[PDB]
Design a protein around this ligand. Structure first.
Ligand SMILES: COC1=C(OC)C(=O)C(C/C=C(\C)CC/C=C(\C)CC/C=C(\C)CC/C=C(\C)CC/C=C(\C)CC/C=C(\C)CC/C=C(/C)CC/C=C(\C)CC/C=C(\C)CCC=C(C)C)=C(C)C1=O
Ligand SMILES: COC[C@@H](CCO[C@H]1CC[C@@]2(C)C(=CC[C@H]3[C@@H]4C[C@@H]5O[C@]6(CC[C@@H](C)CO6)[C@@H](C)[C@@H]5[C@@]4(C)CC[C@@H]32)C1)CO[C@@H]1O[C@H](CO)[C@@H](O[C@H]2O[C@H](CO)[C@@H](O)[C@H](O)[C@H]2O)[C@H](O)[C@H]1O
Ligand code: HEC
Ligand code: HEC
Ligand code: HEC
Ligand code: HEC
Ligand code: HEM
Ligand code: HEM
Ligand code: HEM
Ligand SMILES: [Ca+2]
Ligand SMILES: [Ca+2]
Ligand SMILES: [Cu+2]
Lengths: 16, 304, 268, 468, 200, 232, 49
């Protein structure tokens, strides 16, 4: 619950 | 109630009554019969107390209310789970049982009248003065906090005296509305139509449709209003804005059927935030027979 | 001390207060620079004021409090009635209206201390800022030598004198008037020519002027805590006049008035 | 040696002050019921919020202060001893004023428990118990340090009142706190109703009848200067009254969801309780045997006698409304309010007025009230204004009961509820006028007390206390 | 008959006798209401009021509507016809405090649940005279403005659970979200609509 | 004119969302250097590992201050004004000012960063929450009608009765991730976290002060008795 | 002064002294507690290779 609340805004799409 | 609590609610009460009898009999044990001017001696601040006896009428009232107390407490419930020996009720006076007998006697006497008028069609009852006064009172009680005390309504509630009917006006519709309840829907055309379009077509209902004049000094586009009307406004309304009676769509050409106002400050609200009016389904709270005469009082308040 | 936090209010109030020393006609700028220890308010001024605030002035204050209490105990306390209780003494030499400070006034002061601590702890634990007056909001921003607050004001307990300084259009005369506002209280004992001590037995003029002085002091503090305003400036000037007149006219209106006879024994 | 008259005179002054405020607020809420626009659409002056303040100030601030004054005064004089402790005696005054101020500051803000006469919330109901245990200590220790061999009947009434309105206070306020001044009762539904009304019927009967019966027992024979009518009648009245006022509680839930055995017990116990109350009234009235002619000269004695008469009226009405057949007509009608104000304006307010008009020129050293003519005027204003209130509310409540219960021969209801409201509106205006009359009488007493309080020199106050 | 004099000479004996006499009545009418099934068994089909319903009941308590309205329909034919099925004990088992009332300045509210639309309660609770010209009900044009913050919703639910109301951790968690952005008028109206819904 | 915001410092979820918003959208330019990640995690109820993984982007330790790489002088050169440290900004400006300021950015081509602020005119801060709020402009929109404080709501629906006004902050539709209410909640959580950061001792202060005041009332009772007695 | 009530005076003095001593301990709590290792001190250290 806290982890979802604290998710960083920037999402990076990575190879594999 | 367990037998412990029954015996508790019996023993404590009977002990309180017997002790209250002992109190009134011991205190009167050695009364000086005749009224006395002699003081009791002890003076506290000058307040000396006489030794006059217990007045007879007060003593008789005391022991007469302590025999009516083994009265209502032997006929009616109260001495624990003890039921009662009052002739009649099978189980002593119980609020529920008194109510049941009251309603049973009221279904034999008041009840048969409700069925005669329930068998006629809603218009034959309608021209029966007695059913009309029954309506009058039942509408006054159950049906005036919305539709007004005069069947004309207020802001948001239809005038079922005026001859325009949004949900239909035939006798059946004036019974299905009153029985099944009606939840009319006006979709919120605020953003779906544009914040300015809700103020252009709004000046197409108040204008040509309603036959009024835009508040002097206001601005709109009647042409764009109509081009909106004919596209996203005419489906469940009328093509001339005169209502589809089976969706509850009112007459947009008559500013007397409007239950949500007619000004070009109140017509936008209808066209911006939506309006979803509800007719309380009056079957459960009233029944099927009291609600079939309330279906006739509205057919002789407006239709006749 | 207010400079020590090194907030915006700290820095800029110190800057203005020390620039006041630049108003002295001849040695003003040199004196201000010498006080600052730098060409502006800086960490040198901070460390210097910290040393003064943490040791030197605490020592001076403790010594002055010792001298104050010693002088009082030499001459004895006044009282609300202004009655010289020492005049009337019993066979043991104890004044008739006198009671031993310990234990009676020690317990009274204990009660007063508990009440004060109740208020003090309420402020500490619930309203430490006190609406921004005990801890000013702009002082929670770090000192910025290059951006000054939109409106810089003193701590509330310096606001009255500030108003006086702000009431004088001239800078040097404003500084002089602010200094005299405090210096006149020194000569107060010689300004009062009343035959009685307590305001309870002074004439109507003394009561009126004490009311005027208290109101003027409060108004000066209230209007020195805000940015200048037309009504604020007018009332600040009027209250400066009244504040100085309370002292300047004291030697006169303490004589013109008619005083009540002081009772031989304290009332109560 | 003397009496601690400081606390009694503080209580009397605050009794006048609190009665004026409470009755003015009652008039304000009555006007609101007449004209809704008197709410001014403000949250803190609406009828729903202010009415609890009225009913908790008149009972606890006016009546409570009056009973404190007449207990701290009667107990000492009848015991010939100073109050137990001046410390706790003054604390019971300042803390009671704090309780009144809490009622003023909280109930308008909406911090209420919904319990008719336990509206003061958590941390406000805990201080009212802290200051009530101190009151019990002050009274019973004084009764312990007596200098006389017996204890007077009024002392018995006051002590029973004090103990019962501590047991009731702790029991009815047994709740759980959500915050300061926010609470939830530990009882639910029928249990909560039974506890609430077992407390509320003792907020009267004990706070308004037993304690005031002691005030009567002292001030009636004292004012009339005649001995009490009967010692045995006093004993029976006291004992039966205290043993039946607890029992008679369930008559406030006569036809509700409460189990029917409890309702029957309550009605029967109230019908029994009729007798001891009338015994007390008989004692009070017949204490005046041979002294009725003093009613033409002394308006204070008129106050006391009319208070006793209204007490008899109320204690006859109440048992009648305890009958379920009668209670069916009048359970939610204005007749309940009419009975309340018959027992409050007629009985509690009048006995209070008579007792303070006697006490105040004894704790201040002044021999007489500033204006006896003002006393007579206040008596007439209170009588015409309690009678008006009683009659208007009787008519109103009977009208509402009949209209709600009225049924046409068809079985349909004859009238709607709005019809009952409009029919009651004339009763509302007449009630407002009667309340205005009583408030004018209260204002007259406040002026008389202000003019009697001033002109009372330091020594005159001091000599009056001198113990005897 | 002179034995009474003993209680006069001893404060302790008189105090004990008074305590016992006042306790006898109380211990017979309140204690047995506990452990009695009729006054403690909820009517089948009822559930604890939702978080918003609880907040609405709290507002109903705050505005002191108990002094005017009653939530106890007596078992009288006129009463039940006017208001509906008479109230029963099981309906109030989770009501801390009970709001039956003792005065009817307005109609009984024991069965208003579902009788009238939400759009009536609004426009009647904002200005009662707008829809009932003769109404003496005070206007409440402030429940619309102020909005519930949900500060005490969790604590209120937990305390009510401690008092026996069958709440669940899901309700405690979700109360704050349920009362996040809803005005006090919405909460009061929702509480009103839930009244007497268990019995029809 | 500021907008009031009811900030619940006991709301751990709201403070957590505000901390996330601050760490992502604000710590790019603003430091919270008077505040440690460890204390923020302890007070917000965030596990230390979770705080490390989710809110510490600068490689600092848990016990380190919330410092950022952007130096005040560099940022002053770049923006025209140094982004102040935001640990105490809630105390410096107040929560209402922050709530109104973070929602008052509107497009202004005349300005260096294309935006201005109603609360802070000519502010040097770029509108960094534009992606969330969306494009906000000074235009015409519906505002509740008010006449000398006579505020009109809809009696039936309970919604405001509105008239058009052409000097109002309006968000261009479908330009931001969050609607008005969602952005309001985002800004509320951010300002709640800033309020906590400015005064992290508030809740403990209230508790300790309650106990202190209870003790002082007790001590006052005893001292008052010892005074009034002994003064007889 | 007429017949000072000793014991009551002694009890009040003792009770006030004890309560004041408790308050003194409480007021000392901030000063003694501030001397324990602060958050600056508790930074700890990581293993060194
Ligand atoms: C907006 O803005 C504004 C506000 O703000 C926001 C305001 O608030 C205000 C309002 C302001 C107020 C009302 C606030 C007022 C506040 C103040 C008054 C603050 C003022 C404080 C200062 C600026 C500090 C100034 C300090 C000064 C000038 C004093 C300096 C003193 C020294 C440096 C001391 C010198 C040291 C000495 C003498 C050394 C010791 C000497 C020795 C010889 C030691 C002994 C040595 C020996 C013994 C050896 C020699 C031996 C001997 C003698 C031989 C014989 C031996 C023997 C011993 C006998 C305004 C107007 C304002 O607009
Ligand atoms: C423009 O409207 C004026 C209103 C009055 C005011 C505030 C103004 C200029 C000088 C002020 C005086 C300087 C002296 O300063 C003081 C103190 C310093 C003394 C040396 C002289 O007197 C004042 C009594 C004297 C004084 C403080 C009293 C009031 C004077 C502005
Ligand atoms: C007595 C209990 C009632 C009778 C008989 C009727 N009603 Fe109503 N009413 C209400 C609304 C909001 C509507 C319109 C719904 C909509 O489309 O938004 C109505 C409408 C009717 C109609 C027909 C209307 C028409 O013009 O054709 C009839 C015949 C009718 N109602 C009968 C509102 C309310 C209300 C508020 C809660 C109550 C208590 C009642 N109405 C009661 C009655
Ligand atoms: C808390 C703020 C309250 C709520 C919620 C309601 N009331 Fe009342 N009430 C009062 C009167 C004199 C009436 C007459 C009829 C009318 O005004 O429409 C009413 C009516 C209602 C109703 C309608 C009930 C029905 O069966 O139609 C509801 C739902 C209602 N009220 C809700 C009087 C009073 C009152 C006396 C001053 C107060 C304090 C309240 N009402 C409080 C509330
Ligand atoms: C979360 C998105 C952020 C919040 C909340 C705040 N900031 Fe900034 N900011 C930036 C600059 C260059 C300035 C100075 C502008 C000037 O002085 O004219 C600011 C200023 C603020 C302020 C004003 C504080 C005051 O005391 O006046 C507040 C309250 C504030 N900021 C809050 C720059 C930036 C920036 C660089 C792109 C970012 C990412 C943020 N700000 C983020 C936030
Ligand atoms: C069906 C989906 C509809 C569409 C599309 C439009 N209207 Fe409507 N309208 C509809 C209903 C069911 C109602 C009554 C709802 C109720 O609660 O009573 C209405 C009502 C109106 C009114 C009059 C309001 C009143 O008090 O009676 C107006 C002026 C109105 N609607 C305007 C309007 C316009 C301009 C529309 C197209 C742009 C439009 N409506 C569409 C049903 C439906
Ligand atoms: C700032 C620290 C100060 C301390 C600790 C202090 C201490 C005391 C104490 C304990 C007393 C005796 C009790 C009392 O009268 O209240 C006293 C008396 C007095 N103080 Fe203060 N004082 C201080 C500041 C001042 C100031 C700033 C003034 C005036 C400018 C002042 C003027 C007086 C006078 C005149 C008296 C005796 C008056 C009387 O007997 O009524 N003191 N001081
Ligand atoms: C033997 C004496 C009395 C009896 C048996 C009695 C009985 C009753 C009854 C039957 C009710 C109706 C309550 C209801 O229907 O809800 C009632 C209400 C009330 N009466 Fe009495 N009464 C008596 C004396 C008094 C006195 C002397 C007073 C005031 C001094 C008083 C004040 C009240 C109050 C406060 C209520 C509660 C009002 C309410 O329920 O809201 N009563 N009483
Ligand atoms: C001018 C004098 C007074 C006026 C105008 C007045 C007015 C009112 C009004 C309007 C109500 C509520 C009416 C209703 O809800 O239908 C009420 C209730 C009440 N009043 Fe007063 N009052 C006065 C004096 C008193 C006094 C002196 C007492 C007690 C000492 C008292 C005790 C009560 C009680 C206990 C209730 C609650 C009745 C109930 O809940 O059924 N009143 N009063
Ligand atoms: Ca009630
Ligand atoms: Ca009531
Ligand atoms: Cu009763």
């Amino acid at each position: 619950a806290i982890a979802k609340r604290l998710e960083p805004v920037g999402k990076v799409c990575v190879q594999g | 109630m367990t037998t412990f609590w029954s015996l508790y609610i019996t023993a404590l009460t009977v002990g309180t009554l017997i002790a209250l009898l002992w109190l009134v009999f011991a205190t009167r044990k050695g009364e000086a019969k005749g009224t006395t001017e002699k003081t009791m001696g002890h003076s506290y601040d000058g307040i000396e107390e006489y030794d006059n006896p217990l007045p007879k009428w007060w003593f008789m009232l005391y022991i007469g209310t302590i025999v009516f107390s083994v009265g209502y407490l032997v006929l009616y419930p109260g001495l624990g789970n003890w039921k009662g020996v009052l002739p009649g009720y099978e189980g002593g006076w119980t609020q529920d049982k008194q109510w049941e007998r009251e309603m049973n006697i009221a279904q034999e006497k008041y009840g048969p009248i409700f069925a005669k008028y329930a068998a006629m069609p809603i218009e034959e009852v309608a021209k029966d003065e007695h059913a009309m006064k029954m309506g009058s009172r039942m509408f006054a009680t159950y049906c005036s906090i919305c539709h007004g005390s005069d069947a004309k309504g207020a802001l948001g509630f239809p005038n079922l005296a005026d001859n325009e009917w949004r949900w239909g006006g035939d006798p059946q519709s004036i019974e299905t509305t009153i029985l099944g309840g009606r939840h009319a829907i006006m979709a919120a055309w605020g953003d779906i139509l544009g914040e300015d379009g809700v103020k252009n077509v709004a000046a197409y209902v108040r204008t040509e449709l309603a036959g009024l004049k835009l508040p002097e000094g206001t601005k709109a586009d009647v042409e764009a209003g109509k081009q909106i009307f004919s596209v996203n406004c005419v489906a469940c309304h009328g093509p001339e804005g005169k209502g589809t009676a089976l969706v509850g769509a009112p007459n947009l050409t008559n500013p007397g059927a409007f239950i949500y106002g007619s000004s070009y400050a109140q017509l936008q609200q209808t066209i911006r935030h939506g309006r979803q009016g509800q007719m309380p389904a009056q079957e459960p709270y009233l029944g099927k027979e009291k609600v079939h005469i309330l279906a006739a009082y509205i057919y002789n308040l407006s239709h006749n | 001390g207010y400079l020590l936090p090194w907030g915006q209010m700290s820095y800029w109030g110190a800057q203005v207060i020390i620039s006041l020393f630049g108003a002295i006609p001849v040695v003003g700028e040199d004196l201000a620079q010498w006080i600052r220890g730098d060409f502006l308010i800086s960490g040198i001024t901070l460390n210097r004021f910290f040393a003064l605030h943490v040791i030197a002035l605490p020592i001076v204050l403790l010594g002055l409090v010792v001298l104050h209490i010693l002088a009082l105990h030499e001459v004895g306390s006044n009282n609300p009635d202004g009655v010289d209780i020492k005049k009337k003494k019993d066979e043991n030499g104890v004044p008739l209206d006198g009671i031993a400070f310990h234990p009676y006034y020690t317990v009274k002061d204990i009660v007063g201390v508990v009440v004060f601590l109740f208020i003090f702890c309420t402020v500490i634990f619930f309203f430490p800022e006190m609406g921004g007056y005990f801890l000013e909001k702009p002082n929670f921003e770090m000192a910025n030598q290059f951006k000054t607050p939109e409106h810089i004001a003193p701590v509330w307990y310096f606001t009255p004198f500030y108003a006086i300084l702000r009431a004088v259009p001239d800078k040097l005369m404003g500084v002089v008037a602010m200094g005299a506002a405090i210096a006149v209280l020194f000569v107060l004992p010689w300004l009062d020519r009343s035959p009685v001590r307590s305001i309870r037995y002074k004439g109507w003029l003394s009561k009126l002027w004490l009311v005027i002085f208290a109101v003027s002091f409060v108004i000066l503090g209230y209007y020195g805590a805000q940015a200048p305003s037309p009504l604020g400036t007018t009332l600040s000037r009027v209250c400066t006049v009244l504040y100085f007149a309370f002292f300047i006219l004291m030697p006169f209106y303490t004589r013109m008035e008619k005083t009540k006879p002081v009772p031989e024994r304290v009332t109560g | 040696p003397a009496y601690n008259y400081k606390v009694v005179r503080q209580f009397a002054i605050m009794t006048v002050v609190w009665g004026v405020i409470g009755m003015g607020l009652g008039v304000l809420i009555a006007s609101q019921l007449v004209w809704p626009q008197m709410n001014f659409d403000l949250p803190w002056t609406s009828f729903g919020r202010l009415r609890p303040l009225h009913t908790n100030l008149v009972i606890f601030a006016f009546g409570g202060c009056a009973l404190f004054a007449t207990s701290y005064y009667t107990v000492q004089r009848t015991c010939q001893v100073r109050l137990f402790s001046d410390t706790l005696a003054a604390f019971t005054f300042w803390g009671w004023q704090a309780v009144a101020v809490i009622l003023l500051v909280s109930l308008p803000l909406g911090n209420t428990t919904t319990k008719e006469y336990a509206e003061i919330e958590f941390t406000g109901a805990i201080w009212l118990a802290i200051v009530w245990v101190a009151y019990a200590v002050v009274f019973f220790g004084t009764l312990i340090k007596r200098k006389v061999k017996h204890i007077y009947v009024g002392n018995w009434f006051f002590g029973s009142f004090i103990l019962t309105t501590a047991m009731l206070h702790i029991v009815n306020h047994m709740s759980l706190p959500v915050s300061w001044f926010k609470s939830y009762s530990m009882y639910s539904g029928a249990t909560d109703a039974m506890v609430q009304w077992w407390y509320g019927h003792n907020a009267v009967g004990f706070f308004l009848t037993t304690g005031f019966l002691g005030m009567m027992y002292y001030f009636v024979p004292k004012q009339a200067g005649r001995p009490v009518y009967s010692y045995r009648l006093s004993i029976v009245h006291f004992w039966a009254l205290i043993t039946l006022y607890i029992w008679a509680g369930p008559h406030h839930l006569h036809y509700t969801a409460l189990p029917d055995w409890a309702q029957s017990l309550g009605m029967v116990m109230s019908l029994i309780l009729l007798a001891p109350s009338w015994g007390g009234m008989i004692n009070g009235m017949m204490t005046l045997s041979g002294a009725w002619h003093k009613l033409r000269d002394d308006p204070i004695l008129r106050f006391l006698v009319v208070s006793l008469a209204f007490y008899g009226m109320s204690t006859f009405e109440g048992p009648m409304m305890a009958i379920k057949t009668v209670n069916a007509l009048s359970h939610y009608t204005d007749w309940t309010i009419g009975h309340v104000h018959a027992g409050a304006l007629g009985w509690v307010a009048m006995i209070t007025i008579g007792s303070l008009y006697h006490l105040i020129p004894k704790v201040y050293g002044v021999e007489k009230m500033h204006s006896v003519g003002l006393i007579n005027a206040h008596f007439w204003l209170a009588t015409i204004g309690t009678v008006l209130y009683i009659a208007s509310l009787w008519v109103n409540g009977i009208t509402q009961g009949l209209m709600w219960r009225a049924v046409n021969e068809d079985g349909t209801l004859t009238y709607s509820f709005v019809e009952s409201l409009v029919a009651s509106h004339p009763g509302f205006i007449v009630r407002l006028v009667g309340g205005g009359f009583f408030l004018t009488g209260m204002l007259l007493m406040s002026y008389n007390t202000w003019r009697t309080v001033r002109q009372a020199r330091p020594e005159g106050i001091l000599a009056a206390a001198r113990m005897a | 008959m002179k034995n009474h004099e003993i209680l006069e000479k001893n404060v302790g004996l008189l105090a004990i006798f008074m305590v016992i006499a006042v306790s006898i009545g109380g211990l017979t009418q309140i204690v047995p209401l506990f452990f009695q099934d009729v006054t403690n068994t909820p009517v089948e089909g009822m559930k604890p009021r939702t978080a918003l319903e609880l907040e609405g009941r709290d507002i109903y308590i705050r505005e002191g509507c108990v002094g005017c309205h009653s939530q106890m329909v007596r078992p009288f034919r006129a009463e039940t016809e006017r208001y509906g099925h008479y109230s029963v004990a099981g309906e109030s088992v989770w009501d801390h405090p009970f709001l039956w009332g003792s005065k009817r300045t307005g109609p009984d509210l024991a069965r208003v649940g579902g009788r009238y639309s939400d759009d009536w309660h609004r426009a009647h609770l904002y200005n009662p005279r707008n829809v009932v010209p003769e109404s003496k009900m005070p206007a409440y044009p402030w429940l619309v403005e102020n909005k519930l913050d949900g500060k005490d919703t969790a604590t209120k639910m937990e305390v009510l659970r401690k008092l026996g109301v069958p709440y669940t951790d899901e309700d405690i968690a979700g109360a704050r979200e349920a009362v996040k952005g809803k005005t006090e008028m919405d909460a009061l109206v929702a509480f009103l609509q839930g009244l007497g819904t268990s019995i029809k | 004119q500021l907008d009031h915001v009811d900030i619940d410092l006991t709301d751990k979820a709201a403070m957590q969302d505000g901390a996330r918003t601050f760490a992502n959208y604000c710590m790019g330019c603003h430091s919270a250097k008077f505040q440690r990640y460890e204390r923020v995690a302890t007070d917000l109820g965030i596990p230390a590992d979770l705080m490390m993984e989710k809110l510490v982007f600068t490689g600092a330790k848990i016990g380190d201050h919330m410092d950022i790489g952007m130096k005040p002088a560099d940022a002053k050169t770049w923006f025209g004004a140094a982004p102040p440290d935001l640990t105490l900004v809630a105390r410096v400006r107040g929560t209402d000012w922050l709530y109104s300021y973070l929602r008052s950015f509107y497009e202004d081509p005349k300005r260096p960063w294309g935006v201005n602020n109603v609360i802070f005119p000519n502010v040097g801060m770029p509108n960094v929450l534009a992606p969330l709020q969306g494009r906000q402009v000074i235009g015409c929109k519906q505002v509740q009608v008010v006449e000398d404080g006579k505020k009109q709501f809809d009696p039936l629906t309970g919604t405001p009765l509105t008239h058009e006004a052409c000097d109002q902050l309006t968000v261009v539709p479908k330009t931001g991730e969050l609607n008005e209410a969602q952005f309001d909640e985002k800004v509320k959580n951010l300002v709640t976290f800033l309020a906590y950061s400015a005064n992290p001792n508030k809740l403990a202060s209230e508790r300790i002060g309650t106990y202190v005041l209870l003790y002082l009332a007790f001590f006052f009772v005893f001292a008052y008795l010892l005074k009034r007695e002994y003064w007889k | 002064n007429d017949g000072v009530n000793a014991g009551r005076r002694r009890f009040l003095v003792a009770a006030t002294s004890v309560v004041g001593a408790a308050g003194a301990v409480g007021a000392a709590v901030p000063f003694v507690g501030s001397w324990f290792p602060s958050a600056k001190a508790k930074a700890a250290g990581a293993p060194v290779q």
